[PDB]
Design a protein around this ligand. Structure first.
Ligand SMILES: *[C@@H]1O[C@H](CO)[C@@H](O[C@@H]2O[C@H](CO)[C@@H](O[C@@H]3O[C@H](CO)[C@@H](O)[C@H](O)[C@H]3NC(C)=O)[C@H](O)[C@H]2NC(C)=O)[C@H](O)[C@H]1NC(C)=O
Ligand SMILES: *[C@@H]1O[C@H](CO)[C@@H](O[C@@H]2O[C@H](CO)[C@@H](O)[C@H](O)[C@H]2NC(C)=O)[C@H](O)[C@H]1NC(C)=O
Ligand SMILES: *[C@@H]1O[C@H](CO)[C@@H](O[C@@H]2O[C@H](CO)[C@@H](O)[C@H](O)[C@H]2NC(C)=O)[C@H](O)[C@H]1NC(C)=O
Ligand SMILES: *[C@@H]1O[C@H](CO)[C@@H](O)[C@H](O)[C@H]1NC(C)=O
Ligand SMILES: *[C@@H]1O[C@H](CO)[C@@H](O)[C@H](O)[C@H]1NC(C)=O
Ligand SMILES: *[C@@H]1O[C@H](CO)[C@@H](O)[C@H](O)[C@H]1NC(C)=O
Ligand SMILES: *[C@@H]1O[C@H](CO)[C@@H](O)[C@H](O)[C@H]1NC(C)=O
Ligand SMILES: OC[C@H]1O[C@@H](O)[C@@H](O)[C@@H](O)[C@@H]1O
Lengths: 52, 203, 203, 150, 150, 150, 150, 150, 150, 150, 150, 150
């Protein structure tokens, strides 16, 4: 009709930062923990080092 | 190394986000929302001043500690078969602390000129306070970084000289030339930090 | 819901709002029924020129006398960016030979877009349209304000440069400080983690 | 006039001022402890002397506290941004200086503890260098104090 | 007039004190444990004579929990942002100081538990070294009590 | 009144509340069970007496599960900022607490099972270290029961 | 009235719930396969006993599929922020819990596979560990279903 | 009438789906072929019996092609953004599923092609493992059609 | 009307389409050249047979060459967002599918050439594997073509 | 309403057209010489014959020059969005194709010169290999013309 | 009316023309220096013939200096931002091309100078590789001039 | 009037001008000193000569001064954005040029000290190389002047 605006609401400029930083922190934490749990030293004891 | 990989990942993600955001905004004719004036006018001069004040001592202390450990470890280790080197080789430690002394004096000097004001909008504050805050931040940053690199170089050469002196007594008295030439860059940093803020009249 | 247009041989000033209500002694009352469809509204005091605008709404006898709300908007050529921005410079109220200034602050958009700001009331959950203390009368709730001035084309109402906030005025300062602390905490963590020990034991 | 965002900076300054010093002292004590463990087996008699590097690291903790209460004795609801950032600067200065002093104390304490085990005469020299390490904390405290009044 | 988001910051304090606290009590209670195994094979008599570091790590965990429970008990929905800042600062200080204390007690225990098996005298020294780390933890508490009262 | 997007946090704290804790539990098993295998080639008699680390990793997991359900069943179409933000805090707290406890439990189980393959006398003391880890799980739960509840 | 991109999170729910579950199952199968290849060449008798770490690992994928079909078929055109956030939480929950569970099955499968080559009596105990190593995933599925019930 | 994203997301889904399928299948077939080439050095006479893993890797890329063509066919210029989001989700899901499955097939196939040269009894067991990887492939289809219909 | 920036996505699509094919054809030749150089030192007879991999990577180059030309053949100023999106999807799909195919071609070619260095008749089976890699890229060339016609 | 100042992107195209491609040539040389001198320890009589690997590297540089000029020859004040984007596409395509070609030729020459050091019979066949690497560069230029011409 | 901030870009262009190129030439001498440390200790007589890489690095620096001076000289107040972007592109172009040339020159000079100690004939090969390694900077300079003058 | 943020750019330029010069000078001096100390054991008579490198590095520090003073004298409250951009460009150019020159002198001196320790005829040759490094630094100075007093 008159091409109204989308109704972008106030206080959004704070929620964006809040959610962004929380998401970044949580993603980084899961990344680091899974990464460390992958490169894991089983020990290389008489079960592992031994073969044949 | 996991930590280096983490740092690289964060850095690359940050710069990729910056590049993509910049390109889409520039193509989108939205250059009117990039008003750097608002970015560098909303910030209070006192934030810039106080960040400079903190750094002007923090980085100097960091450099002093770096040089202290780097020379002290070798001084203590190398004297087992030559206790004579304990007292001959104390010049390096003295300079490693003189760096922090210069840092503290500069912190005291720049700490002056902190009279508050009452303006709360950019049009009322004026140019003078903005100049004051920026200049004080710059002076603090330059003095801190100069003294940091100075202390590191001093500590490295002090370690080298202390370690070499245990072989022949007639070495150290001439190897200290590089040790003395170390401090000149920190002196230059202090001089420039002095000069940058010689015309601030905040208040 | 049609908007209000000032027809100076062409569309020149356009105004729209989903709420616009007023209170004299804290009795809020409806005024959207008295606008946006009433063609006999007092627009005699309104004026137009390129780079200047007044929109004066003198509402009909209510509470003993007609009440006039006068929006004063101006635009000027900004040198550095080489563009044309505007801002509603002032707001006045005329009832009985009395004047005030509910000064407008957080309004500026280029001549390519219109404005939008939800719940711009003026009082407690707004924080603006300030009256500079001496608070006498005339609270006024505007919600979903919209405007275009100093050049229009037809009846079309274009996309809006909403000032909902790029990031914010203050969280930039907060984020700078916290990131600066974060770097130092990472310095601490790198050396606290990568400490080392000895193996077996000296006899 | 002053928004509600003000005391943010002062409170974080108060927290960091002590957090960094605590971390530095902790690292110094850790390094000195492992050094003592290495030193002990051959020369027990020096044990009660080789505590000297450890207590030295502990000093840093107390220094942080000298500011960590002080800034907390001046905070109030009606505080301007200027005083808040002054507090922040003091806190950052003292905290980072404490961190650096803790690192240096730990390293030189380990080195001297290892050294004395094979040469008792080294003892004197060790303490001397350690004096400088303590001074690293002291300067970092001093500026903070004069940033709490002006 | 108070902003809605304010309480958020205080709530994060209710997390943060505990969040890092347990982490410190996971740095030590594990590592020192390995130590008490390494010589239970040979000198099992000293299994219970050097378990002190683990108890101290539990004590830093308690130091975190006290501030956490007080933080939660001082909760409301219309909190002014200043009290929120204070609360989060207290939580952060306690958490990070506890993490550092846990680190130090852990590494010192893992060293001293091995050291004690080569000579008995070292035991006395460690009863000091460990306690020095513990001092840091106590210090954190004090500052929190100034940030929850002033 | 209540913002409609406010439900976001009301669920997000639930997700983290299960994830972090559970993930640490994985770490725990990956140092306990593996260790048993290394010690189960020569002392095959100590198979059933080395399951305790696994059941404690189970305990630290169920802590995260129970808190997650407790903070997830309160959700509805009109969540208020107060409750949602409390759930975020509680979930983050318990998740990171469970993570740290699981890590410590894993290291303890590995070292203890390695040390029990040559001298049974260690065993009881081993269990002692383990309980010092399990209670850390409980610590997280405490905060989560006083933030999500009120 | 509702946001235009509100269904994004609804689709992302099923997307994550399927993808991370599949990733975990695939990794478990891969590492278990490496284990069988390493171990069974010496001992062909166990070519049908090390199959459990794979087939019991594959249950993760079926769990993820069970969640994903429901999430995909529970999306309408009129979705608000509340429902979409519920779906997002459920999907992320199952994905990350299944990742951890897959990891645990992979490592414990390697351990049990290489331990069963020595003595058959390690057939029983290891499988018991495996039960808990899969429950680390099972728990998660449960809560996600609640986040789709409302 | 419709936004500018009415067709960006369909193409992004198609492109990313096919790209991820290509990467996964390439890695799988390449790893299997390297295994075959290294195996052929001692026992070249078994090349024609070990082409199975390469085809088992490529079949999932056939499935990715099917889904890519399908997401292509349903794309026009008057489609609501709902279907755009849905098709992007389906494309990304099938792409990552194919990637994971192909990588697992590659790892198992290479290790097992190396292993089988020393024991004929291995031949049967591996084939079963391969079918399990193939199971993941069909699971992708179980979602790939679903998001196309609702 | 059509926004003027529409051509951007089709342009970058064509560019990426050819660029990724270039990278793949570079990787393929890079590995296979090392393989043939290693092989050719001791048995020069097989050289005629071992030129195949690079000749084949040339076809992966052609795959992107033709598609880029076809994409650019339908670009002008009055392009709607639609056809630009379609060109981008086609280009990226072909480019990265060719990249993956070239990667597999290179790895398998180098390994197989090294294997055939001793026993030439592996060229019978090796070559079959090679074909599959190319065929993977062909899946791309169809899909992109379809997205260039609709 | 002409486009604002799009000419930026236009110039950037020219930059890429040699920033990557020329760089690729550099890499090639850094490998080819690194081969040649090694090979010169053995056969000092074939130095001249071993420079043909270098020569083609230079050729790819010339491509990254010529196309670049054909961009900078069209520059004016009133470049529209259309032409500038076409310049960007051409430059990116040719530059990155040249980079890939440079990597390939560098690796091939390095391996090949050392390989041919021992057996001349390789050399002649190897020339064909090198040619195809060069041909990749050729293809790049072609695409970067066809897009730029429309 | 062209804006004032547009000039900024132009200034930065000059900076690149003296920063990036310079760094390249740094390598172009530095590595060569350590090469001499291995050459003249046994074969010092050739030192005078080993200065060529250093002269090439000086030539790279000369190219950087001439373009930087040309860019800086033409600068003025009333610039159209298109001119500024053109200058920025030329400066970046020459800087990165000179960087590539310096890297290649340094590595080639190092290899050749170490290799000549056992081949008296390496001089011609070193020169004939160096011409190609240095032509890159010349091409970058040519295009930089053709851009800037236009 | 002028904008209120003009002086910020000049401030940052003046700071960087000395920061980078100091870092370069520190690195060069440290490496020259280490080389002298290492060499001094075997050839005590060359100690004076090997100081020629270190003093060279010092000269770069002076260059920093000649810029940072010059900005600080020409800065005032209300300068225009143009002059601020000019000063920032000059400062950054000289700073990074000095840094690169410092690295060059450091490496060359570290090698040349050794060369003269083991071979007298080396010395003068290396002197030439050191001068070349210095040349780069001086070039930076030139540019800054043309960008400062303009
Ligand atoms: C709307 O306009 C202003 C904010 O937009 C409010 O404050 C006015 O601003 C003036 C400067 O912009 C204030 O400063 C005063 O300026 C006058 C004229 O130069 C001097 O005489 C005064 O000394 C100076 N300072 C003070 C402290 O008075 C004005 O005070 C002020 N204008 C007034 C009161 O008319 C206004 O409050 C607001 N308008 C009104 C009518 O209240
Ligand atoms: C704006 O819409 C609101 C509802 O969202 C209407 O609400 C009334 O607001 C006035 C004051 O502005 C109050 O006195 C009334 O009590 C409200 N009425 C209700 C909630 O029933 C409002 O009428 C709309 N427009 C105007 C001009 O007021
Ligand atoms: C100007 O007009 C207002 C009305 O908007 C006057 O209001 C008076 O209010 C009383 C209330 O009982 C009425 O009965 C009177 O008729 C009104 N007039 C007077 C003269 O009292 C108000 O007085 C005037 N306001 C001013 C001068 O500020
Ligand atoms: C202004 O002109 C428009 C467009 O023709 C018309 O619809 C509207 O009624 C006019 N308004 C007034 C106030 O004259
Ligand atoms: C409009 O208001 C003005 C205010 O001065 C008045 O003079 C005029 O008569 C009013 N017009 C009508 C139509 O009431
Ligand atoms: C034009 O704008 C000017 C500037 O304010 C104003 O004085 C004048 O009255 C306006 N109208 C005209 C010229 O019709
Ligand atoms: C309003 O827009 C027109 C049409 O583009 C433009 O020419 C004019 O300059 C603008 N008005 C002002 C005051 O700049
Ligand atoms: O406010 C306008 C004034 O002028 C006259 C009337 O319109 C009254 O309503 C009032 O006294």
């Amino acid at each position: 009709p008159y091409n109204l605006a989308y109704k972008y609401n106030l206080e959004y400029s704070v929620v964006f930062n809040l959610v962004l930083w929380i998401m970044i922190g949580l993603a980084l934490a899961v990344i680091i923990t899974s990464y460390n749990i992958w490169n894991m030293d089983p020990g290389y004891d008489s079960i592992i080092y031994r073969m044949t | 190394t996991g930590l280096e990989l983490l740092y690289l990942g964060i850095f690359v993600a940050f710069w990729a986000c910056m590049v993509v955001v910049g390109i889409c905004y520039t193509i989108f004719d939205l250059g009117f929302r990039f008003d750097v004036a608002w970015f560098l006018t909303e910030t209070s001069p006192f934030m810039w001043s106080n960040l400079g004040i903190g750094l002007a001592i923090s980085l100097s202390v960091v450099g002093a500690a770096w040089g202290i450990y780097i020379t002290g470890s070798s001084i203590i280790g190398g004297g087992v078969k030559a206790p004579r080197i304990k007292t001959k080789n104390l010049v390096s430690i003295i300079f490693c602390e003189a760096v922090a002394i210069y840092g503290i004096i500069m912190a005291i000097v720049i700490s002056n000129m902190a009279e508050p004001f009452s303006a709360t909008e950019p049009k009322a504050i004026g140019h003078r306070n903005y100049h004051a805050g920026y200049s004080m931040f710059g002076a603090g940053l330059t003095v801190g970084l100069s003294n940091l690199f100075c202390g590191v170089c001093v500590g490295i050469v002090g370690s080298g000289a202390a370690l070499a002196d245990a072989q022949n007594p007639s070495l150290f008295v001439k190897i200290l030339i590089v040790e003395i030439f170390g401090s000149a860059i920190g002196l230059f940093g202090v001089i420039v930090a002095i000069l940058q803020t010689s015309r601030v009249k905040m208040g | 819901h049609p908007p209000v247009s000032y027809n100076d041989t062409a569309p020149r000033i356009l105004f729209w709002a989903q709420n616009f209500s007023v209170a004299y002694k804290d009795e809020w009352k409806d005024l959207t029924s008295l606008t946006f469809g009433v063609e006999n509204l007092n627009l005699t005091g309104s004026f137009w020129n390129d780079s200047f605008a007044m929109l004066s709404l003198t509402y009909e006898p209510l509470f003993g006398a007609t009440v006039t709300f006068k929006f004063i908007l101006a635009s000027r050529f900004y040198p550095v960016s080489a563009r044309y921005w505007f801002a509603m410079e002032r707001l006045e109220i005329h009832s009985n030979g009395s004047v005030a200034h509910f000064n407008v602050s957080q309004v500026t958009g280029p001549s390519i877009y219109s404005f939008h700001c939800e719940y711009v009331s003026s009082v407690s959950k707004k924080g603006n349209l300030l009256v500079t203390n001496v608070p006498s009368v005339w609270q006024m709730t505007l919600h979903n304000f919209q405007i275009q001035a100093f050049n229009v084309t037809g009846e079309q109402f274009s996309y809006a440069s909403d000032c909902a906030g790029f990031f914010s005025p203050g969280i930039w300062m907060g984020l700078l400080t916290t990131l600066f602390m974060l770097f130092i905490f990472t310095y601490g963590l790198h050396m606290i983690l990568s400490l080392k020990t000895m193996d077996r034991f000296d006899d | 006039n002053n928004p509600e965002y003000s005391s943010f900076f002062g409170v974080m300054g108060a927290s960091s001022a002590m957090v960094f010093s605590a971390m530095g002292a902790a690292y110094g004590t850790a390094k000195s402890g492992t050094g003592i463990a290495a030193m002990s087996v051959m020369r027990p008699e020096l044990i009660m002397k080789s505590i000297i590097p450890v207590v030295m690291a502990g000093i840093i903790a107390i220094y942080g506290l000298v500011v960590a209460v002080l800034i907390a004795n001046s905070l109030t609801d009606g505080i301007t941004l200027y005083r808040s950032f002054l507090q922040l600067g003091a806190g950052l200065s003292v905290g980072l200086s404490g961190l650096a002093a803790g690192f240096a104390i730990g390293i030189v304490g380990d080195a001297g503890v290892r050294g004395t085990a094979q040469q008792p005469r080294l003892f004197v020299g060790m303490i001397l260098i350690l004096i400088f390490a303590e001074v690293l904390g002291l300067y970092g405290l001093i500026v903070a104090l004069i940033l709490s009044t002006k």
